[PDB]
Amino acid sequence: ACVTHEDCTLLCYDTIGTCVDGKCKCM
Structure with missing residues (x-):
């Protein structure tokens, strides 16, 4: 779901x- x-x-x-995993999340 992310591009950059x-x-x-x-x-x-x-x-x-x-x-x-197609998902943007901060560590």
């Missing part, structure tokens, strides 16, 4: 590096 870091800027630094 910008698409998940709300996340501290995403889960892995841009997206995982």
Whole structure:
């Protein structure tokens, strides 16, 4: 569901590096 870091800027630094399991979540 993610496209890039910008698409998940709300996340501290995403889960892995841009997206995982089609779901964007901060570690």
